[PDB]
Design an enzyme around this catalytic site. Structure first.
Site, PDB file in Angstrom:
ATOM      1  N   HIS B  49      17.273 -24.232  12.253  1.00  0.00           N
ATOM      2  CA  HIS B  49      17.833 -22.914  11.508  1.00  0.00           C
ATOM      3  C   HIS B  49      19.173 -22.787  11.194  1.00  0.00           C
ATOM      4  O   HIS B  49      19.702 -22.174  10.323  1.00  0.00           O
ATOM      5  CB  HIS B  49      17.300 -21.833  12.489  1.00  0.00           C
ATOM      6  N   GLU B  52      20.109 -24.747   8.179  1.00  0.00           N
ATOM      7  CA  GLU B  52      19.809 -24.171   7.057  1.00  0.00           C
ATOM      8  C   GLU B  52      20.992 -23.213   6.386  1.00  0.00           C
ATOM      9  O   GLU B  52      21.133 -23.258   5.096  1.00  0.00           O
ATOM     10  CB  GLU B  52      18.342 -23.208   7.308  1.00  0.00           C
ATOM     11  N   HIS B  53      21.448 -22.608   7.303  1.00  0.00           N
ATOM     12  CA  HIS B  53      23.027 -21.943   7.042  1.00  0.00           C
ATOM     13  C   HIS B  53      23.969 -23.014   6.492  1.00  0.00           C
ATOM     14  O   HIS B  53      24.638 -22.499   5.689  1.00  0.00           O
ATOM     15  CB  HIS B  53      23.296 -21.150   8.294  1.00  0.00           C
ATOM     16  N   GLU B 122      29.685 -19.552  11.248  1.00  0.00           N
ATOM     17  CA  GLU B 122      28.028 -19.071  11.378  1.00  0.00           C
ATOM     18  C   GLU B 122      27.610 -18.656  12.713  1.00  0.00           C
ATOM     19  O   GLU B 122      26.510 -18.294  12.638  1.00  0.00           O
ATOM     20  CB  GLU B 122      27.216 -20.563  10.745  1.00  0.00           C
ATOM     21  N   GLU B 129      21.978 -11.982  14.101  1.00  0.00           N
ATOM     22  CA  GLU B 129      20.586 -12.078  13.425  1.00  0.00           C
ATOM     23  C   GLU B 129      19.825 -11.861  14.439  1.00  0.00           C
ATOM     24  O   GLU B 129      18.591 -11.241  14.288  1.00  0.00           O
ATOM     25  CB  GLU B 129      20.417 -13.520  12.734  1.00  0.00           C
TER      26      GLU B 129
END
Ligand SMILES: CCCCCCCCCCCCCCCCCCCC(=O)O[C@H](COC(=O)CCCCCCCCCCCCCC)COP(=O)(O)OCCN
Lengths: 53, 438
Positions: B49, B52-53, B122, B129
């Site tokens: 994940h 992906e960022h 990030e 999140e």
């Protein structure tokens, strides 16, 4: 001995039926313990995580 | 009859799969990868994940800003998602902007910077999140459902990963992850809509030819999960709506019971009080629920993985004093899959599914998702004729046999969120998985 029999003539039969009852009831007691513990284990095993709001 | 899906390979082992539609003007091209969070261990959980960022944070050539501009100039958009077993990166564009989009995708996948400065930036975005998924109740419920059903196993892990990992993920372990997993034999380049197959194969030879091959190339969609009957209760009296999921261990993509399980799922079906037609649905559960106002909605699911699945139902209800009835009647309808179903329900559900499996594919993105999913789970696109034959082969008596070994008297995974005081303890829920009258 004869007079003891005269007072309680069921004596012999009573004690034999008692042996049968003892055995059945003991086995049922053992099984009821297993079944109770089986059914209760989700409650006994419950865990919590608290995050104060 | 839809146009045939063309399939080619490269030398490295990259599959190219395409379905052209000369009636549309847009094209969805993308890369479907047979890899996801499940490929992480406990220490690097969250890496997939995280990547992906960073895939959109700049490459060796284009900076983050140049990347933004290049896509803006193309006119379409890029999108990505990471699941437990699958990663997707696609680009929707105009017909003649397809070579640009393939080039950008090839760049972000192979030649991403993963600069320490961007990792650090990030790391906060992703931390935030963690505290905002909390609102997406369905996602909360399904993530806890996996966590408990596959307790302490790779499928049980979340995609985001724990807070601790987010703080400790390095560019080294990011690089290692994508080098080990994003190999040519695990990847499918997919084109749907206004794409020429031969053009797409040439673009693949130009951009994806220097992809690593894995040491041991297994077929696409190659995997032992041990389901745990269990429950998670997230009681919150301040929420107005209760969200409840109940599942059993379901079927994998390649199970012989795959279609049987889909038919069973369609017999229960879905319900939503906000849809006008839902009060008139044929499903018995739908009738019980609507007549008695037991729920706002329910949705049957049959989720598949490479080696396991979850089959169950997701319920939402404001009726907090009749949660017991809702759950009771739901599980009694499942019981009837074992005891009562006949050709009446089965033939009805088959009719509904024969169309449903085709209806779903209504835009280029849905078509691309279908090609990509099927190629990465089954190793091939299954034609509608084959699917029609597999559905037709399901009999009432297959459904009964399946339900008797999968549902009847089986352990469930149960997650409740919200005002769930009325949801009984595990035993009373699990006792409804059989009928004493049968
Ligand atoms: C009223 C008092 C209740 C307490 C009952 C305890 C024992 C009484 C049973 C009579 C008895 O002597 O039975 C013995 C066996 O005991 C046993 O095996 C009986 C113990 C079982 C414990 C309780 C189980 C259910 C009993 C109550 C339900 C009654 C109504 C429900 C339909 C041996 O007698 P035998 O074996 O020679 O008998 C002929 C059939 N072979």
């Amino acid at each position: 001995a004869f007079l003891t029999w005269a007072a309680e003539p069921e004596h012999d039969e009573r004690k034999k039926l008692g042996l049968k009852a003892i055995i059945v009831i003991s086995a049922m007691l053992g099984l009821s313990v297993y079944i109770k513990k089986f059914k209760w284990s989700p409650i006994k095993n419950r865990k919590f995580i608290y995050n104060p709001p | 009859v839809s146009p045939k899906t063309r399939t080619s390979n490269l030398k490295n082992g990259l599959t190219i799969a395409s379905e052209s539609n000369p009636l549309v003007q847009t094209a969805t091209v993308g890369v479907w990868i047979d890899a996801g969070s499940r490929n992480e261990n406990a220490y690097n959980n969250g890496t997939a994940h995280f990547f992906e960022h960073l895939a959109f944070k700049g490459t060796d050539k284009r900076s983050q800003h140049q990347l933004e501009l290049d896509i803006e100039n193309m006119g379409g958009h890029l999108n990505a998602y990471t699941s437990r077993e699958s990663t997707v990166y696609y680009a929707k564009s105009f017909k003649d902007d397809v070579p640009k989009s393939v080039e950008i995708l090839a760049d972000i996948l192979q030649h991403s910077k993963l600069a320490e400065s961007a990792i650090d930036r990030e790391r906060e975005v992703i931390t935030r999140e963690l505290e905002e998924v909390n609102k997406q109740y369905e996602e909360v419920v399904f993530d806890h459902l996996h966590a408990t059903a596959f307790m302490n196993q790779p499928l049980g892990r979340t995609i985001l990963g724990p807070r601790e990992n987010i703080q400790t993920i390095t560019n080294t372990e990011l690089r290692k992850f994508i080098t080990e997993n994003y190999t040519a034999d695990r990847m499918v380049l997919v084109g749907a809509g206004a794409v020429d197959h031969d053009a797409l194969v040439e673009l693949a030879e130009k951009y994806f030819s220097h992809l690593p091959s894995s040491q041991s190339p297994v077929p696409l969609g190659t995997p032992i999960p041990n389901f745990v009957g269990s429950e998670v209760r997230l009681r919150d009296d301040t929420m107005p709506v209760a969200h409840i999921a109940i599942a059993v261990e379901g079927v994998s993509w390649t199970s012989e019971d795959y279609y049987t399980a889909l038919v069973a799922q369609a017999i229960i079906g879905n319900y939503d009080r906000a849809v006008g037609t839902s009060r008139h649905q044929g499903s018995r559960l739908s009738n019980i629920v609507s007549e008695n106002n037991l729920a706002n909605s329910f949705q049957s699911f049959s989720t598949s993985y490479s080696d396991t699945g979850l089959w169950g139902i997701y319920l939402t209800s404001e009726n907090t004093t009749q949660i017991d009835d809702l759950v009771h009647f739901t599980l009694k309808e499942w019981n009837r899959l074992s005891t009562s179903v006949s050709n009446l329900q089965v033939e009805r559900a088959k009719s509904q599914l024969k169309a449903g499996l085709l209806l779903s594919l209504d835009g280029t993105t849905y078509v691309a998702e279908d090609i990509g999913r099927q190629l990465t789970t089954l190793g091939r696109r299954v034609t509608p004729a084959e699917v029609e034959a597999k559905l037709e082969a399901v009999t009432e008596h297959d459904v009964r046999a399946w339900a008797q070994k999968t549902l009847y008297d089986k352990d469930i995974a149960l997650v409740g969120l919200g005002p769930i005081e009325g949801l009984y303890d595990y035993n009373r829920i699990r006792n409804d998985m059989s009928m004493m009258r049968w």
